[PDB]
Ligand binder design. Structure first.
Ligand SMILES: [Zn+2]
Ligand SMILES: [Zn+2]
Ligand SMILES: [Zn+2]
Ligand SMILES: [Zn+2]
Lengths: 385, 433, 295
């Protein structure tokens, strides 16, 4: 019965085209198993200066293995990567690390952009018991009251790491729809290997996007989907003003070494508990402390540092696309317009405008690292006007 | 407010010098410092295992109700308190039998020993809660009547009074319904006990925010698996329009920044007779001239031997190899000049920045004459003297020496100035009476 | 281990190199590149593993001077690794025939560059920016050539000789920030004018910016400084320390400002002299942009 039936599952799998060329097409189906969803982007409108809120379910669902030795191990490790790749892409923003554990919510790291503080917090978050049940109501309470004091010229989005369990919290979180719909705060959850309808209704009543974790690769995808600053609901803001351009200071300008250290509890700046020698300078406090391209606590305006953060999204929107042809128009001497090679896996990648020939390793290098076709350069800037 | 300033010694160390150096008052301490964390920092003691507890603890109240004869009194909620935080009239019943069981510890066992098993009829207090819960379900009966839709108690009743039947459908039990009379009595109470535990959500759903709509059936219920509602609708040309005008502005004004414009056109103007092309002719001639000159590389054999131009090339190397006379030992008084200002004046200065940021803030809206409050226009006046006086003796304590003082006071006078800037700018918009 | 690749970006402005001949200089373009050629060979003289990348900036294009793009290397593609079984150019080598393996291919292709004096594309000047990535894709493939116990130490040289062109400021900035991802050093020697923008690119890299002392005196600093490894410079205690760099103006009128403000969600920070959006025809939400005009 089953001793045969356990091995009727092997009968077909093991066997293939016999005689010659065996265990060959089994490898071909594995390549045919590949090539999942690429981009499907092309959007406009919103996404600028997010104010994210990490919300972590700490529950007994973590004790199931399912991808890793812990579901936090699946979670927490790639959050650091998600932190770094965020600060890579979006430095104009800041993130609220808030942890739910034992039916409450602990705002673990404040809404800020200092990566080491966030990452070591995750390195502190390693040895978490995740005792108790999830409570989103305490999480939204922090999320309200913090972002309540943020301007309406702020992007208001929440990223919830939920372990798909029972949403164990009172006090009419169904009525928190109209609370937060009016409060123009977006809330995005993704479910860990299952679905919560109420939370699924929550996000579809939000405009925040809900998903379910499939796999570790798939876990990365939706992170990567939420790296990009999304086009949230209309009528948020237009502008955001008193973007402080700073100065770097060399502390060697006119008076050479007239100050042994530029942090002595009286100097304009010197914000954090450490010694400094003068590296930076804000306009409004005239605040000189450790360099930070974010904001301050006395002038209270945004320490904008343009080549970093006014450059990041500044080309992250205006992209175009390529096309693929299997044909052989042999442009070059059977070459690439970029790296100049050939393999011909029938993916001859042609630009939409300048129409230049590329490979996967030239398409990926654009579509992950270069983000534009340089074949448009020499082709845009010469007749540009 | 006082437990806040005692349990936190760092903020107390901040709160000390406003009394020690007499910077501000306590009335001024709780007027412009906290003001936001009254919801944020006070969000700990109110929630505490999600208050307005309805569906969080109720999952765990029955399994964690007993460890042992005395496994109780953990912390605050430990294992007894949120039981009280759901039943109200039953909480009045608890209060009624604490002297009946004398010791409260005795009550913790007795009041819950017999109610846990099957049935509690030994004391008036146990019987009080027992009878009340039947009335509670009788009270819970009346509320379910008021909804009365999607409830086939209505739909079943239409088919049984009509033939005068479904009393036999009740009275048709097999399997030895003759001589036990034990669990027939028991299980219906446990049915009743967990329906109490089921309506314990209902007994705590009112605690949430009173949670009432009671369902007038909303007669549409349009099965919409189709239709393509497609809730979000972006892309009605919003950043398409920005791209058409900002790159147009990045076209007509391509980098009008510091070096980005002024050196740019100045050397384009230096190209001169470039539409005349007479320079471009000589260019294209010099393109044609040294065309051949590179490739021969006999001219470019010896484009190296100029040791005349090695010495000067060695020179600014050696010149930049030794800068000198710039106070190598720049510190070594900094340790004394750290511990003396970073004993008070790190926190003292922070007393200002908790306030002076708001001092920038009220003036950050004041000429609109909207945020013009008496609470704020004299808060302009209040801390003005409360800070710019209390720094003067920390200023005057360090002018004990002269060059030990005059280096650091080049950097503190901003605090005097950003004060006086604000004060100076205050009358740039002259306020009326 | 490692392979130690070099990248070299040379400015070849024949407008300016013609202008280099207009003064009848004691340092011409012929005198220029030959130093740069042996500079590329100097890289090769440290190790057989060393690999080079050379691309000038023609007015219409930037063809890979090195490795090549013609039938002398379209079928040859270098001797070590994946051999073409090609005898004559695959025969003679060892510190001197490798250079004439590459000497030819530059002077033949700058011949192909200096035969195109027929510019009518409205002074299409120095096209550094698109020319940069032409390396960066190729070394990405060269990263994928072998990596197995093979750290690719790439190192980017940029050579400036003329003014920058009018290219797209975003497409200026981004690739450096992409090079910031790429973890490869970029070093810069300029000759004629200073580039505040491209020295900011140096600051992004933490590379090296250089104003030349003199154009015929560009053989000893070029020897010492523009010389590889990040080992020779993190150990060789000699760094041009200067990097004075103030920046941060805005785009509506013209300024040099310490306070910016964005005009719409589009990241358009303009000068304060700005009633209505010149970033779009979408009007500004009337609560905030007159507060830029209020205090
Ligand atoms: Zn300020
Ligand atoms: Zn390619
Ligand atoms: Zn292109
Ligand atoms: Zn704008």
């Amino acid at each position: 019965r089953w001793e045969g039936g356990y091995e009727r599952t092997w009968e077909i799998l093991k066997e293939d085209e016999s005689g010659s060329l065996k265990a060959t097409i089994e490898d071909i189906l594995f390549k045919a198993k590949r090539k999942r969803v690429f981009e499907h982007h092309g959007q406009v409108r919103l996404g600028m200066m997010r104010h994210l809120y990490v919300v972590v379910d700490g529950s007994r669902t973590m004790e199931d293995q399912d991808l890793k030795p812990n579901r936090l191990t699946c979670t927490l490790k790639l959050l650091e990567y998600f932190v770094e790749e965020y600060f890579d892409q979006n430095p104009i923003s800041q993130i609220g690390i808030i942890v739910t554990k034992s039916k409450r919510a602990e705002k673990l790291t404040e809404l800020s952009g200092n990566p080491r503080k966030h990452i070591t917090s995750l390195k502190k978050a390693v040895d978490m018991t995740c005792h108790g049940e999830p409570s989103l109501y305490n999480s939204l309470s922090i999320a309200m009251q913090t972002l309540k004091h943020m301007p309406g010229h702020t992007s208001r989005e929440v990223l919830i790491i939920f372990s798909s369990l029972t949403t164990c919290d009172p006090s009419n979180i169904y009525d928190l729809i109209k609370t937060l719909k009016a409060a123009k705060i977006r809330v995005s959850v993704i479910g860990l290997s299952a679905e919560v309808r109420v939370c699924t209704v929550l996000a579809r009543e939000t405009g925040g996007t809900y998903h379910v974790i499939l796999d570790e690769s798939h876990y990365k995808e939706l992170l990567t989907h939420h790296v990009s600053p999304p086009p949230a609901s209309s009528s948020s803001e237009c502008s955001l003003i008193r973007m402080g351009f700073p100065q770097h200071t060399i502390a060697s300008l006119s008076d050479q070494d007239a100050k042994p250290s530029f942090s002595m509890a009286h100097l304009d700046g010197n914000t954090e508990p450490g010694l400094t020698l003068g590296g930076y300078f804000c306009p409004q406090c005239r605040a000189k402390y450790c360099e930070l391209p974010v904001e301050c606590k006395i002038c209270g305006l945004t320490l904008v540092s343009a080549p970093h953060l006014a450059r990041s999204y500044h080309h992250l929107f205006p992209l175009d696309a390529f096309q693929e042809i299997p044909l052989e128009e042999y442009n070059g001497e059977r070459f690439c317009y970029g790296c100049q090679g050939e393999l011909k896996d029938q993916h001859v990648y042609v630009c939409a405008v300048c129409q230049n020939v590329f490979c996967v390793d030239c398409d990926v290098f654009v579509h992950d690292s270069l983000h534009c076709c340089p074949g448009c350069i020499h082709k845009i800037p010469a007749p540009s006007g | 407010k006082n437990r806040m300033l005692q349990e936190d010694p760092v903020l107390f160390q901040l709160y000390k010098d406003l009394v020690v150096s007499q910077v501000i008052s306590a009335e001024e301490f709780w007027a412009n410092r906290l003001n936001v964390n009254a919801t944020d920092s006070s969000s700990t003691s109110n929630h505490k295992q999600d208050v307005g507890i309805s569906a969080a603890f109720l999952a765990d109240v029955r399994p964690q109700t007993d460890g042992c004869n005395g496994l109780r009194y953990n912390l605050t909620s430990d294992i007894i308190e949120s039981i009280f935080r759901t039943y109200p009239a039953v909480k009045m019943k608890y209060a009624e039998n604490v002297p009946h069981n004398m010791t409260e510890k005795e009550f913790w066992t007795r009041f819950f020993q017999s109610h846990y098993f099957h049935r509690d009829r030994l004391n008036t207090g146990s019987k009080d809660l027992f009878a009340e819960c039947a009335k509670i379900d009788e009270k819970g009966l009346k509320t379910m009547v008021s909804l009365g839709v999607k409830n086939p108690l209505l739909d079943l009743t239409a088919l049984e009074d009509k033939p005068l039947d479904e009393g036999y459908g009740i009275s048709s039990v097999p399997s030895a319904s003759n001589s036990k009379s034990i669990k027939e009595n028991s299980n219906a109470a446990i049915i009743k006990r967990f329906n109490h535990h089921s309506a314990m959500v209902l007994a705590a759903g009112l605690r949430k925010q009173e949670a009432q709509n009671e369902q007038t059936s909303e007669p549409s219920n349009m099965d919409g698996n189709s239709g393509d509602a497609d809730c979000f609708q972006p892309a009605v040309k919003r950043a398409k329009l920005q791209e058409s005008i900002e790159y147009e502005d990045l076209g007509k004004n391509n980098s009008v920044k510091t070096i980005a414009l002024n050196l740019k056109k100045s050397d384009r103007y230096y190209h001169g007779p470039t539409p005349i092309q007479s320079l471009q002719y000589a260019t294209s001639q010099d393109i044609i001239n040294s065309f051949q000159s590179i490739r021969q590389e006999m001219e470019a054999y010896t484009p190296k031997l100029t040791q005349v131009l090695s010495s000067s090339a060695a020179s600014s190397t050696i010149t930049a190899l030794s800068p000198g006379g710039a106070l190598m030992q720049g510190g070594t008084q900094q340790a004394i000049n750290q511990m003396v200002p970073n004993d008070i004046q790190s926190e003292l200065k922070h007393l200002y920045v908790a306030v002076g940021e708001l001092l920038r803030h009220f003036w950050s809206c004041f000429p609109v004459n909207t945020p013009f409050l008496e609470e704020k226009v004299v808060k302009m006046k209040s801390n003005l003297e409360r800070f710019q006086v209390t720094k003067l003796c920390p200023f005057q304590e360090k002018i004990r020496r002269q060059y030990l003082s005059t280096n650091l006071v080049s950097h503190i006078e901003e605090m005097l100035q950003t004060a006086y800037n604000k004060l100076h700018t205050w009358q740039s918009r002259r306020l009326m009476k | 281990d490692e392979l130690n690749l070099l990248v070299i970006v040379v400015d070849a402005n024949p407008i300016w190199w013609g202008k280099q001949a207009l003064k009848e200089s004691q340092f011409t373009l012929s005198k220029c590149i030959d130093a740069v050629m042996v500079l590329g060979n100097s890289h090769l003289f440290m190790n057989r593993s060393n690999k080079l990348a050379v691309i000038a900036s023609h007015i219409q294009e930037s063809r890979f001077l090195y490795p090549g793009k013609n039938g002398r290397l379209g079928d040859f593609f270098g001797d070590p690794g994946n051999p073409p079984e090609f005898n004559p150019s695959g025969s003679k080598d060892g510190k001197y025939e490798l250079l004439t393996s590459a000497n030819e291919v530059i002077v033949e292709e700058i011949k192909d560059l200096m035969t195109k004096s027929d510019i009518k594309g409205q002074h299409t000047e120095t096209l550094l920016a698109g020319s940069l990535a032409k390396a960066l894709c190729y070394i990405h493939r060269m990263n994928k050539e072998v990596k197995d116990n093979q750290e690719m130490k790439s190192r980017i040289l940029v050579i400036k000789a003329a003014e920058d062109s009018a290219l797209q400021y975003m497409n200026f900035m981004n690739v450096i920030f992409a090079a910031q991802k790429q973890n490869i050093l970029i070093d810069a020697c300029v000759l004629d004018s200073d580039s505040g923008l491209l020295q900011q690119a140096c600051d992004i890299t933490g590379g090296l910016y250089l104003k030349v002392p003199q154009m015929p005196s560009l053989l000893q600093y070029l020897l010492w400084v523009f010389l590889p490894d990040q080992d020779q410079r993190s150990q060789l205690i000699l760094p041009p320390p200067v990097h004075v760099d103030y920046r941060a103006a805005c785009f509506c009128h013209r300024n040099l400002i310490e306070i910016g403000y964005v005009c719409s969600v589009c990241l358009s920070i303009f000068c304060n002299f700005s009633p209505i959006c010149t970033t779009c025809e979408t009007a500004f939400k009337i609560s905030l942009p007159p507060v830029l005009k209020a205090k």
